Protein backbone atom coordinates (compact mmCIF):
# COMPACT_ATOMS: atom_id res chain seq x y z
CA UNK A 1 0.00 0.00 0.00
CA UNK A 2 0.97 3.46 -0.28
CA UNK A 3 1.27 6.50 2.57
CA UNK A 4 -0.32 9.98 2.27
CA UNK A 5 2.45 12.55 3.83
CA UNK A 6 1.08 15.89 5.59
CA UNK A 7 4.19 18.60 4.59
CA UNK A 8 3.72 22.27 4.39
CA UNK A 9 6.11 25.47 4.99
CA UNK A 10 3.34 25.93 8.02
CA UNK A 11 5.05 23.43 9.93
CA UNK A 12 8.83 22.97 8.56
CA UNK A 13 10.43 20.07 9.41
CA UNK A 14 7.80 17.39 10.22
CA UNK A 15 4.82 15.55 8.73
CA UNK A 16 2.55 13.06 9.42
CA UNK A 17 1.28 10.62 7.41
CA UNK A 18 -1.54 7.98 7.03
CA UNK A 19 -1.54 5.16 4.67
CA UNK A 20 -3.91 4.35 1.80
CA UNK A 21 -6.61 1.84 2.02
CA UNK A 22 -7.67 3.78 -1.36
CA UNK A 23 -7.93 6.70 -3.09
CA UNK A 24 -11.94 7.80 -3.32
CA UNK A 25 -11.91 11.03 -5.35
CA UNK A 26 -9.09 13.87 -6.52
CA UNK A 27 -10.26 16.99 -8.04
CA UNK A 28 -8.92 20.89 -8.41
CA UNK A 29 -12.24 22.78 -7.56
CA UNK A 30 -12.64 26.47 -8.21
CA UNK A 31 -10.75 27.31 -4.88
CA UNK A 32 -8.73 23.71 -3.93
CA UNK A 33 -7.08 20.23 -4.82
CA UNK A 34 -9.73 18.33 -3.02
CA UNK A 35 -8.56 14.73 -1.92
CA UNK A 36 -10.49 12.13 -0.42
CA UNK A 37 -8.64 8.37 0.52
CA UNK A 38 -9.65 5.44 3.13
CA UNK A 39 -7.06 5.42 4.93
CA UNK A 40 -6.26 2.13 6.90
CA UNK A 41 -6.87 3.27 10.38
CA UNK A 42 -8.31 6.65 10.80
CA UNK A 43 -11.15 5.69 7.91
CA UNK A 44 -11.40 8.17 5.63
CA UNK A 45 -9.77 11.42 5.20
CA UNK A 46 -10.37 14.49 3.40
CA UNK A 47 -7.32 16.76 2.43
CA UNK A 48 -7.56 20.30 0.95
CA UNK A 49 -4.19 21.64 -0.43
CA UNK A 50 -2.70 18.71 0.62
CA UNK A 51 -3.46 19.60 4.57
CA UNK A 52 -5.61 17.21 6.73
CA UNK A 53 -9.01 18.92 7.30
CA UNK A 54 -10.38 16.01 9.11
CA UNK A 55 -10.89 12.06 9.32
CA UNK A 56 -13.30 10.03 10.99
CA UNK A 57 -11.54 8.65 13.92
CA UNK A 58 -11.17 11.56 15.31
CA UNK A 59 -13.43 14.43 14.31
CA UNK A 60 -15.49 14.05 17.02
CA UNK A 61 -12.99 16.04 18.95
CA UNK A 62 -12.68 19.07 17.04
CA UNK A 63 -16.46 19.57 15.85
CA UNK A 64 -18.11 18.96 19.50
CA UNK A 65 -15.16 21.07 21.53
CA UNK A 66 -15.99 24.04 18.53
CA UNK A 67 -19.42 23.56 18.99
CA UNK A 68 -20.79 22.53 22.64
CA UNK A 69 -18.25 25.25 24.18
CA UNK A 70 -19.75 28.52 23.00
CA UNK A 71 -23.50 26.94 22.49
CA UNK A 72 -23.50 25.70 26.52
CA UNK A 73 -22.69 29.64 27.27
CA UNK A 74 -24.52 31.65 25.04
CA UNK A 75 -27.89 31.05 27.05
CA UNK A 76 -30.86 30.30 23.89
CA UNK A 77 -29.11 30.84 20.75
CA UNK A 78 -31.71 30.96 18.13
CA UNK A 79 -29.45 32.10 14.88
CA UNK A 80 -26.24 30.44 14.36
CA UNK A 81 -23.56 31.03 11.75
CA UNK A 82 -20.82 28.51 10.61
CA UNK A 83 -18.19 30.23 8.60
CA UNK A 84 -16.25 27.35 6.28
CA UNK A 85 -17.08 23.48 7.63
CA UNK A 86 -18.74 22.55 4.37
CA UNK A 87 -18.22 18.99 5.71
CA UNK A 88 -21.00 19.81 8.22
CA UNK A 89 -19.75 18.61 11.44
CA UNK A 90 -20.43 21.82 13.08
CA UNK A 91 -23.77 21.61 11.63
CA UNK A 92 -24.31 17.67 12.87
CA UNK A 93 -22.97 19.18 16.41
CA UNK A 94 -25.74 22.28 15.99
CA UNK A 95 -28.59 20.17 15.29
CA UNK A 96 -28.74 18.86 18.75
CA UNK A 97 -30.07 21.74 20.24
CA UNK A 98 -33.34 21.86 19.49
CA UNK A 99 -34.40 25.82 20.75
CA UNK A 100 -32.64 26.25 17.44
CA UNK A 101 -34.30 28.16 15.07
CA UNK A 102 -32.10 29.19 12.21
CA UNK A 103 -28.57 27.38 10.91
CA UNK A 104 -26.70 29.74 8.20
CA UNK A 105 -23.33 28.19 6.48
CA UNK A 106 -20.97 30.30 4.54
CA UNK A 107 -18.64 28.04 2.81
CA UNK A 108 -17.05 29.36 -0.18
CA UNK A 109 -16.66 25.62 -1.95
CA UNK A 110 -19.77 23.62 -3.06
CA UNK A 111 -17.71 20.95 -3.78
CA UNK A 112 -16.37 20.50 -0.41
CA UNK A 113 -20.03 20.41 0.53
CA UNK A 114 -21.18 17.74 -2.34
CA UNK A 115 -18.31 15.47 -1.77
CA UNK A 116 -18.62 15.28 2.10
CA UNK A 117 -22.53 14.23 1.11
CA UNK A 118 -21.40 11.82 -1.00
CA UNK A 119 -18.35 10.51 1.01
CA UNK A 120 -18.62 11.55 4.64
CA UNK A 121 -22.50 10.82 5.14
CA UNK A 122 -22.52 10.91 9.23
CA UNK A 123 -20.89 13.88 9.26
CA UNK A 124 -22.75 15.41 6.45
CA UNK A 125 -26.25 14.49 7.90
CA UNK A 126 -27.26 17.76 9.09
CA UNK A 127 -28.25 19.68 5.99
CA UNK A 128 -31.10 17.26 5.70
CA UNK A 129 -32.66 19.24 8.87
CA UNK A 130 -35.09 22.44 7.60
CA UNK A 131 -33.31 24.71 9.75
CA UNK A 132 -30.20 24.98 7.72
CA UNK A 133 -29.99 27.62 4.92
CA UNK A 134 -26.40 27.23 2.81
CA UNK A 135 -24.45 30.27 0.90
CA UNK A 136 -21.64 29.47 -1.51
CA UNK A 137 -19.45 32.92 -0.88
CA UNK A 138 -16.07 34.13 0.72
CA UNK A 139 -16.88 34.37 4.75
CA UNK A 140 -15.41 37.55 4.04
CA UNK A 141 -18.04 39.06 1.95
CA UNK A 142 -20.81 37.25 2.90
CA UNK A 143 -20.21 39.00 6.66
CA UNK A 144 -20.13 42.58 4.73
CA UNK A 145 -23.43 42.11 3.32
CA UNK A 146 -25.44 40.13 6.20
CA UNK A 147 -28.79 42.25 7.42
CA UNK A 148 -29.60 39.55 10.21
CA UNK A 149 -27.00 39.31 13.48
CA UNK A 150 -26.11 36.24 15.07
CA UNK A 151 -25.77 34.60 18.63
CA UNK A 152 -22.84 32.70 17.64
CA UNK A 153 -20.71 32.18 14.91
CA UNK A 154 -18.43 29.18 14.60
CA UNK A 155 -15.26 29.80 12.08
CA UNK A 156 -13.99 26.64 10.92
CA UNK A 157 -11.98 27.40 8.30
CA UNK A 158 -9.12 25.57 6.72
CA UNK A 159 -5.27 27.46 7.47
CA UNK A 160 -4.35 30.65 6.37
CA UNK A 161 -2.55 29.64 3.13
CA UNK A 162 -5.37 28.90 0.69
CA UNK A 163 -9.10 30.69 0.39
CA UNK A 164 -8.96 30.70 4.13
CA UNK A 165 -5.95 33.40 3.76
CA UNK A 166 -8.97 36.65 4.26
CA UNK A 167 -10.28 34.62 7.29
CA UNK A 168 -6.98 35.61 9.72
CA UNK A 169 -6.74 39.57 9.33
CA UNK A 170 -8.11 42.85 11.85
CA UNK A 171 -10.74 43.97 9.15
CA UNK A 172 -11.87 40.14 9.72
CA UNK A 173 -12.73 40.30 13.36
CA UNK A 174 -14.81 43.78 12.75
CA UNK A 175 -16.98 41.80 10.66
CA UNK A 176 -17.58 38.88 13.23
CA UNK A 177 -18.18 41.91 16.07
CA UNK A 178 -20.65 43.86 13.84
CA UNK A 179 -22.55 40.34 12.89
CA UNK A 180 -23.55 39.40 16.24
CA UNK A 181 -25.89 40.24 18.94
CA UNK A 182 -24.99 42.36 21.70
CA UNK A 183 -24.06 39.58 24.23
CA UNK A 184 -23.31 37.33 21.26
CA UNK A 185 -19.82 34.93 21.20
CA UNK A 186 -17.14 34.05 18.11
CA UNK A 187 -14.87 30.34 18.31
CA UNK A 188 -12.73 29.99 15.83
CA UNK A 189 -9.88 27.49 14.99
CA UNK A 190 -6.69 29.51 15.99
CA UNK A 191 -3.84 26.64 15.36
CA UNK A 192 -1.53 24.84 17.02
CA UNK A 193 0.21 26.46 20.42
CA UNK A 194 3.37 23.83 19.69
CA UNK A 195 4.49 26.02 16.61
CA UNK A 196 2.23 28.76 15.64
CA UNK A 197 2.40 31.12 18.50
CA UNK A 198 3.26 34.13 16.31
CA UNK A 199 -0.08 33.35 14.85
CA UNK A 200 -1.79 32.98 17.88
CA UNK A 201 -0.72 35.98 19.21
CA UNK A 202 -1.59 38.32 16.06
CA UNK A 203 -4.79 36.68 16.14
CA UNK A 204 -5.66 37.37 19.70
CA UNK A 205 -4.42 41.10 19.22
CA UNK A 206 -7.16 41.34 16.61
CA UNK A 207 -9.63 40.04 18.56
CA UNK A 208 -8.49 42.37 21.69
CA UNK A 209 -9.20 45.36 19.54
CA UNK A 210 -12.90 44.94 19.63
CA UNK A 211 -13.85 41.74 22.54
CA UNK A 212 -13.67 42.61 25.63
CA UNK A 213 -12.85 39.08 26.42
CA UNK A 214 -10.53 37.00 24.05
CA UNK A 215 -9.67 33.42 25.86
CA UNK A 216 -7.92 30.53 24.01
CA UNK A 217 -8.18 26.63 24.30
CA UNK A 218 -6.30 23.61 23.39
CA UNK A 219 -7.96 20.55 21.74
CA UNK A 220 -6.27 17.03 21.31
CA UNK A 221 -6.87 15.86 18.29
CA UNK A 222 -4.21 13.41 16.95
CA UNK A 223 -4.51 14.07 12.80
CA UNK A 224 -3.90 17.81 13.12
CA UNK A 225 -0.33 19.04 13.26
CA UNK A 226 1.22 18.37 16.86
CA UNK A 227 -1.83 16.37 17.95
CA UNK A 228 -3.57 19.74 18.74
CA UNK A 229 -5.41 22.69 17.92
CA UNK A 230 -6.84 26.04 19.35
CA UNK A 231 -10.20 27.70 19.70
CA UNK A 232 -9.80 31.53 19.51
CA UNK A 233 -12.94 32.56 22.21
CA UNK A 234 -14.28 35.88 21.84
CA UNK A 235 -17.08 37.15 23.77
CA UNK A 236 -18.65 40.40 24.14
CA UNK A 237 -19.74 40.39 28.07
CA UNK A 238 -17.16 40.27 30.32
CA UNK A 239 -17.71 36.58 31.82
CA UNK A 240 -15.78 34.93 28.62
CA UNK A 241 -16.25 30.62 27.79
CA UNK A 242 -14.28 29.34 30.03
CA UNK A 243 -17.56 27.76 31.66
CA UNK A 244 -20.59 26.22 30.62
CA UNK A 245 -23.99 27.46 31.78
CA UNK A 246 -25.98 24.00 31.04
CA UNK A 247 -25.16 20.48 30.84
CA UNK A 248 -26.13 18.29 27.94
CA UNK A 249 -28.82 15.78 28.79
CA UNK A 250 -31.26 15.84 26.33
CA UNK A 251 -31.26 12.57 24.62
CA UNK A 252 -29.55 13.90 21.80
CA UNK A 253 -26.42 14.24 23.75
CA UNK A 254 -26.43 10.69 25.10
CA UNK A 255 -23.90 9.81 21.98
CA UNK A 256 -21.14 12.33 22.94
CA UNK A 257 -17.37 11.74 22.77
CA UNK A 258 -14.76 13.83 23.90
CA UNK A 259 -16.90 17.01 25.49
CA UNK A 260 -18.13 17.41 29.04
CA UNK A 261 -19.15 20.05 31.30
CA UNK A 262 -15.81 19.95 33.17
CA UNK A 263 -13.05 19.39 29.99
CA UNK A 264 -15.07 22.25 28.78
CA UNK A 265 -13.04 24.41 31.69
CA UNK A 266 -10.12 21.87 31.35
CA UNK A 267 -9.19 23.35 27.87
CA UNK A 268 -8.76 26.18 28.52
CA UNK A 269 -5.87 25.37 31.51
CA UNK A 270 -2.50 26.25 28.80
CA UNK A 271 1.17 25.26 29.25
CA UNK A 272 3.13 27.83 31.34
CA UNK A 273 4.91 29.08 28.27
CA UNK A 274 1.99 30.13 26.35
CA UNK A 275 0.73 31.81 29.06
CA UNK A 276 4.13 33.77 29.17
CA UNK A 277 3.81 34.07 25.73
CA UNK A 278 0.45 36.05 25.86
CA UNK A 279 0.44 38.64 28.48
CA UNK A 280 0.95 42.13 27.29
CA UNK A 281 -0.83 41.51 23.65
CA UNK B 1 18.32 16.64 3.63
CA UNK B 2 16.89 13.23 4.44
CA UNK B 3 14.00 12.52 6.96
CA UNK B 4 13.97 9.90 9.97
CA UNK B 5 10.35 8.47 10.72
CA UNK B 6 8.80 6.68 13.29
CA UNK B 7 6.43 3.72 12.45
CA UNK B 8 5.87 0.81 14.51
CA UNK B 9 3.32 -2.04 14.75
CA UNK B 10 2.25 -0.35 18.02
CA UNK B 11 0.72 2.28 15.90
CA UNK B 12 0.05 0.86 12.40
CA UNK B 13 -0.91 3.40 9.75
CA UNK B 14 0.44 6.25 11.00
CA UNK B 15 3.71 8.00 11.16
CA UNK B 16 5.37 10.99 12.54
CA UNK B 17 8.58 12.33 10.69
CA UNK B 18 11.38 14.73 11.70
CA UNK B 19 13.74 16.27 9.29
CA UNK B 20 17.58 15.26 9.79
CA UNK B 21 20.15 18.16 9.81
CA UNK B 22 22.67 15.64 10.83
CA UNK B 23 23.09 12.18 12.71
CA UNK B 24 25.61 12.79 15.95
CA UNK B 25 25.31 9.06 17.24
CA UNK B 26 24.34 4.91 16.68
CA UNK B 27 25.46 1.92 18.23
CA UNK B 28 23.81 -1.30 19.33
CA UNK B 29 23.85 -1.61 23.07
CA UNK B 30 23.20 -4.83 24.88
CA UNK B 31 20.01 -3.57 25.04
CA UNK B 32 18.73 -1.39 22.24
CA UNK B 33 19.16 0.63 18.94
CA UNK B 34 20.33 3.81 19.83
CA UNK B 35 20.29 7.04 17.65
CA UNK B 36 20.57 10.46 18.48
CA UNK B 37 20.20 13.24 16.02
CA UNK B 38 20.01 17.30 15.04
CA UNK B 39 16.64 17.50 13.40
CA UNK B 40 16.27 20.95 11.59
CA UNK B 41 13.52 22.27 14.00
CA UNK B 42 13.06 20.11 17.38
CA UNK B 43 16.81 20.73 17.77
CA UNK B 44 18.22 16.92 19.20
CA UNK B 45 16.34 13.88 19.29
CA UNK B 46 17.10 10.92 21.19
CA UNK B 47 15.57 7.68 19.24
CA UNK B 48 15.69 4.21 20.83
CA UNK B 49 14.61 1.08 18.77
CA UNK B 50 13.03 3.40 16.34
CA UNK B 51 10.94 5.18 18.49
CA UNK B 52 11.64 8.69 19.40
CA UNK B 53 12.03 8.53 23.58
CA UNK B 54 12.39 12.54 23.34
CA UNK B 55 13.30 16.00 21.87
CA UNK B 56 14.89 19.43 23.04
CA UNK B 57 12.10 21.45 21.83
CA UNK B 58 9.60 19.82 24.10
CA UNK B 59 10.71 16.96 26.16
CA UNK B 60 9.61 20.15 29.17
CA UNK B 61 6.71 18.87 28.73
CA UNK B 62 6.94 15.10 29.80
CA UNK B 63 9.30 15.64 31.92
CA UNK B 64 8.00 18.36 34.33
CA UNK B 65 4.34 16.87 34.03
CA UNK B 66 5.90 13.48 35.18
CA UNK B 67 7.91 14.68 38.18
CA UNK B 68 5.75 17.68 39.46
CA UNK B 69 2.41 15.94 39.76
CA UNK B 70 3.73 13.68 42.27
CA UNK B 71 5.89 15.40 43.93
CA UNK B 72 3.37 18.60 44.58
CA UNK B 73 1.34 16.04 45.70
CA UNK B 74 3.84 13.96 48.47
CA UNK B 75 4.09 16.01 51.43
CA UNK B 76 7.94 16.23 52.27
CA UNK B 77 9.68 13.26 50.05
CA UNK B 78 13.24 12.56 51.28
CA UNK B 79 13.66 9.68 48.64
CA UNK B 80 12.56 9.05 45.23
CA UNK B 81 13.03 6.94 42.77
CA UNK B 82 13.33 7.04 38.67
CA UNK B 83 12.90 3.77 36.85
CA UNK B 84 14.49 4.41 33.60
CA UNK B 85 14.79 8.24 32.79
CA UNK B 86 18.70 7.34 31.58
CA UNK B 87 18.34 10.82 29.63
CA UNK B 88 18.09 12.11 33.20
CA UNK B 89 15.28 14.86 32.36
CA UNK B 90 12.95 13.45 35.39
CA UNK B 91 16.50 13.73 37.15
CA UNK B 92 16.71 17.42 36.74
CA UNK B 93 13.42 18.66 37.47
CA UNK B 94 13.60 16.35 41.07
CA UNK B 95 16.98 18.30 41.75
CA UNK B 96 15.26 21.43 42.02
CA UNK B 97 13.64 20.47 45.74
CA UNK B 98 15.91 21.00 48.24
CA UNK B 99 14.61 18.97 50.48
CA UNK B 100 15.21 15.55 48.67
CA UNK B 101 17.77 13.94 50.24
CA UNK B 102 18.60 11.26 47.93
CA UNK B 103 17.40 9.90 44.50
CA UNK B 104 18.14 6.41 43.31
CA UNK B 105 18.20 6.20 39.29
CA UNK B 106 17.61 2.50 37.85
CA UNK B 107 18.29 2.00 34.00
CA UNK B 108 18.96 -0.42 32.03
CA UNK B 109 21.45 0.89 29.80
CA UNK B 110 24.26 2.73 30.51
CA UNK B 111 24.63 3.57 26.79
CA UNK B 112 21.56 5.61 27.23
CA UNK B 113 23.11 7.81 30.31
CA UNK B 114 26.58 7.95 28.66
CA UNK B 115 25.33 9.15 25.27
CA UNK B 116 22.84 11.89 27.29
CA UNK B 117 26.25 13.46 29.14
CA UNK B 118 27.83 13.77 26.31
CA UNK B 119 25.15 14.84 23.66
CA UNK B 120 22.10 16.30 25.74
CA UNK B 121 24.02 18.69 28.42
CA UNK B 122 21.03 20.16 29.66
CA UNK B 123 18.92 17.44 29.96
CA UNK B 124 21.81 15.27 31.78
CA UNK B 125 23.19 18.02 34.26
CA UNK B 126 21.75 16.80 37.47
CA UNK B 127 23.77 13.76 37.55
CA UNK B 128 26.07 16.02 38.88
CA UNK B 129 24.14 16.49 42.05
CA UNK B 130 25.79 14.63 44.90
CA UNK B 131 22.40 13.02 45.78
CA UNK B 132 21.93 11.24 42.86
CA UNK B 133 22.78 6.90 42.94
CA UNK B 134 23.24 5.49 39.74
CA UNK B 135 22.11 1.33 39.14
CA UNK B 136 22.54 -0.18 36.12
CA UNK B 137 19.79 -2.72 36.18
CA UNK B 138 16.79 -4.12 34.98
CA UNK B 139 14.00 -2.06 37.33
CA UNK B 140 12.35 -5.31 37.65
CA UNK B 141 15.20 -7.07 39.40
CA UNK B 142 16.42 -3.65 41.03
CA UNK B 143 12.99 -3.45 42.81
CA UNK B 144 12.74 -7.08 44.21
CA UNK B 145 16.40 -6.81 45.70
CA UNK B 146 16.13 -3.19 47.43
CA UNK B 147 15.88 -2.67 50.99
CA UNK B 148 14.92 1.15 50.75
CA UNK B 149 11.50 2.49 50.53
CA UNK B 150 10.57 5.66 48.57
CA UNK B 151 8.49 8.55 48.65
CA UNK B 152 7.93 9.04 45.15
CA UNK B 153 8.65 6.25 42.48
CA UNK B 154 8.26 7.66 38.82
CA UNK B 155 8.67 5.01 35.82
CA UNK B 156 9.73 6.94 33.05
CA UNK B 157 10.21 3.85 30.76
CA UNK B 158 10.07 3.13 26.62
CA UNK B 159 7.34 1.00 25.44
CA UNK B 160 6.23 -2.08 25.52
CA UNK B 161 8.34 -3.92 23.12
CA UNK B 162 12.07 -3.30 24.10
CA UNK B 163 13.54 -4.28 27.55
CA UNK B 164 10.46 -1.90 28.97
CA UNK B 165 8.60 -5.36 28.80
CA UNK B 166 9.39 -6.65 32.15
CA UNK B 167 7.89 -3.27 33.50
CA UNK B 168 3.84 -3.68 32.18
CA UNK B 169 2.76 -6.45 34.01
CA UNK B 170 0.88 -7.24 37.34
CA UNK B 171 4.18 -8.59 38.92
CA UNK B 172 5.74 -5.06 38.31
CA UNK B 173 3.02 -3.31 40.07
CA UNK B 174 3.31 -5.46 43.08
CA UNK B 175 7.02 -4.26 43.24
CA UNK B 176 6.46 -0.93 43.30
CA UNK B 177 3.57 -1.14 46.07
CA UNK B 178 6.19 -2.65 48.44
CA UNK B 179 9.07 -0.33 47.17
CA UNK B 180 6.65 2.45 48.41
CA UNK B 181 6.87 3.90 52.28
CA UNK B 182 2.65 3.31 53.37
CA UNK B 183 1.45 7.03 51.90
CA UNK B 184 3.99 6.39 48.90
CA UNK B 185 2.80 7.64 45.23
CA UNK B 186 4.23 6.08 41.63
CA UNK B 187 3.42 7.75 38.25
CA UNK B 188 4.17 5.73 35.39
CA UNK B 189 4.42 6.41 31.11
CA UNK B 190 1.14 5.21 30.20
CA UNK B 191 0.75 5.44 26.42
CA UNK B 192 -1.82 7.51 24.03
CA UNK B 193 -5.58 7.78 24.78
CA UNK B 194 -6.12 7.82 21.13
CA UNK B 195 -4.95 4.22 19.95
CA UNK B 196 -3.54 2.56 23.09
CA UNK B 197 -6.86 2.00 25.19
CA UNK B 198 -6.39 -2.14 25.20
CA UNK B 199 -3.02 -0.79 27.51
CA UNK B 200 -4.51 1.76 29.15
CA UNK B 201 -7.13 -0.62 30.64
CA UNK B 202 -4.81 -3.39 31.47
CA UNK B 203 -2.13 -1.01 33.26
CA UNK B 204 -4.96 0.34 35.08
CA UNK B 205 -5.86 -2.75 36.03
CA UNK B 206 -2.89 -4.29 37.48
CA UNK B 207 -2.47 -1.10 39.40
CA UNK B 208 -6.39 -1.41 41.18
CA UNK B 209 -5.28 -5.25 42.33
CA UNK B 210 -3.38 -3.29 45.19
CA UNK B 211 -3.71 0.74 44.78
CA UNK B 212 -6.46 2.24 46.36
CA UNK B 213 -6.91 4.73 43.66
CA UNK B 214 -5.77 4.96 40.39
CA UNK B 215 -5.96 8.30 37.94
CA UNK B 216 -4.96 8.72 34.35
CA UNK B 217 -4.06 12.26 32.93
CA UNK B 218 -2.67 13.57 29.88
CA UNK B 219 0.19 15.27 28.56
CA UNK B 220 0.53 16.85 25.46
CA UNK B 221 3.55 16.74 23.58
CA UNK B 222 4.04 16.66 19.97
CA UNK B 223 6.82 14.15 18.99
CA UNK B 224 5.15 11.43 20.56
CA UNK B 225 2.88 8.73 18.99
CA UNK B 226 -1.21 11.33 18.35
CA UNK B 227 0.54 13.92 19.98
CA UNK B 228 -0.19 12.80 23.75
CA UNK B 229 0.74 10.62 26.13
CA UNK B 230 -1.14 9.59 29.37
CA UNK B 231 -0.29 9.01 33.21
CA UNK B 232 -0.85 6.15 35.19
CA UNK B 233 -1.32 7.71 38.60
CA UNK B 234 -1.21 5.21 41.90
CA UNK B 235 -2.01 6.23 45.51
CA UNK B 236 -2.50 4.70 48.40
CA UNK B 237 -4.00 6.85 50.20
CA UNK B 238 -7.80 7.88 49.20
CA UNK B 239 -7.13 10.72 48.24
CA UNK B 240 -5.22 10.76 44.68
CA UNK B 241 -2.80 12.70 42.41
CA UNK B 242 -5.03 15.28 41.00
CA UNK B 243 -4.81 18.11 43.34
CA UNK B 244 -1.27 19.52 44.28
CA UNK B 245 -0.06 20.62 47.94
CA UNK B 246 2.10 23.15 47.16
CA UNK B 247 2.87 25.83 44.83
CA UNK B 248 6.36 25.68 42.71
CA UNK B 249 7.51 29.43 43.88
CA UNK B 250 10.71 28.64 44.87
CA UNK B 251 14.05 30.28 42.69
CA UNK B 252 14.51 26.84 41.22
CA UNK B 253 10.97 26.77 39.62
CA UNK B 254 11.03 30.31 37.70
CA UNK B 255 12.18 28.73 34.57
CA UNK B 256 9.11 26.31 33.96
CA UNK B 257 7.86 25.61 30.75
CA UNK B 258 4.70 23.39 30.98
CA UNK B 259 3.16 22.77 34.73
CA UNK B 260 1.49 25.00 36.78
CA UNK B 261 -0.58 24.75 39.58
CA UNK B 262 -3.77 24.82 37.36
CA UNK B 263 -2.87 22.73 34.90
CA UNK B 264 -1.99 19.74 37.27
CA UNK B 265 -5.23 19.83 38.10
CA UNK B 266 -6.19 20.03 33.98
CA UNK B 267 -4.70 17.20 32.99
CA UNK B 268 -6.75 14.66 34.81
CA UNK B 269 -10.23 16.02 33.08
CA UNK B 270 -10.18 13.45 29.87
CA UNK B 271 -12.56 13.11 26.37
CA UNK B 272 -15.95 11.23 27.12
CA UNK B 273 -15.32 8.60 25.36
CA UNK B 274 -12.01 7.75 27.63
CA UNK B 275 -13.76 8.15 30.87
CA UNK B 276 -16.43 5.59 29.33
CA UNK B 277 -13.67 3.30 28.67
CA UNK B 278 -12.85 2.70 31.84
CA UNK B 279 -15.10 2.81 34.04
CA UNK B 280 -16.28 -1.12 35.36
CA UNK B 281 -12.61 -2.02 35.68
C1 LIG C 1 -13.37 21.53 5.89
S1 LIG C 1 -13.61 22.85 7.00
C2 LIG C 1 -12.74 24.19 6.35
C3 LIG C 1 -13.57 24.85 5.25
O1 LIG C 1 -13.24 26.25 5.20
C4 LIG C 1 -13.55 26.61 3.88
N1 LIG C 1 -13.06 27.95 3.64
C5 LIG C 1 -11.78 28.34 3.45
N2 LIG C 1 -11.71 29.66 3.28
C6 LIG C 1 -12.99 30.09 3.33
C7 LIG C 1 -13.65 31.37 3.24
N3 LIG C 1 -12.94 32.52 3.00
N4 LIG C 1 -14.98 31.36 3.38
C8 LIG C 1 -15.72 30.30 3.61
N5 LIG C 1 -15.20 29.06 3.74
C9 LIG C 1 -13.86 28.95 3.60
C10 LIG C 1 -12.81 25.56 3.08
O2 LIG C 1 -13.19 25.57 1.72
C11 LIG C 1 -13.24 24.34 3.85
O3 LIG C 1 -14.38 23.80 3.29
C1 LIG D 1 14.87 7.43 27.68
S1 LIG D 1 13.75 7.10 28.97
C2 LIG D 1 13.33 5.43 28.82
C3 LIG D 1 14.43 4.57 29.44
O1 LIG D 1 13.84 3.36 29.95
C4 LIG D 1 14.91 2.45 29.93
N1 LIG D 1 14.40 1.13 30.22
C5 LIG D 1 13.69 0.32 29.40
N2 LIG D 1 13.37 -0.81 30.01
C6 LIG D 1 13.92 -0.72 31.24
C7 LIG D 1 13.97 -1.56 32.42
N3 LIG D 1 13.39 -2.80 32.42
N4 LIG D 1 14.62 -1.05 33.47
C8 LIG D 1 15.20 0.13 33.53
N5 LIG D 1 15.19 0.99 32.49
C9 LIG D 1 14.58 0.58 31.36
C10 LIG D 1 15.43 2.59 28.52
O2 LIG D 1 16.67 1.95 28.35
C11 LIG D 1 15.47 4.09 28.43
O3 LIG D 1 16.71 4.56 28.82
Given at each position: ??????????????????????????TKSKYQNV????????????????????????????????????????????????????????????????????????EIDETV?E?????????????????????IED???????????????????????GP??????????????????????????????????????????????????????????????????????????????????????????????????????????????????????
Open positions: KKWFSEFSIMWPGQAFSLKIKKILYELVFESTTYGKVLVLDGVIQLTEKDEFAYHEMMTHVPMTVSKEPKNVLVVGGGDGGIIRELCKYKSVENIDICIVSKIYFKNISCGYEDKRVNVFASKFLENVTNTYDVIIVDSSDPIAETLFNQNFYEKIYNALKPNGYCVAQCESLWIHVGTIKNMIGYAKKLFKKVEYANISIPTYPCGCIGILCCSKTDTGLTKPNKKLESKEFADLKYYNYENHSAAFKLPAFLLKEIENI
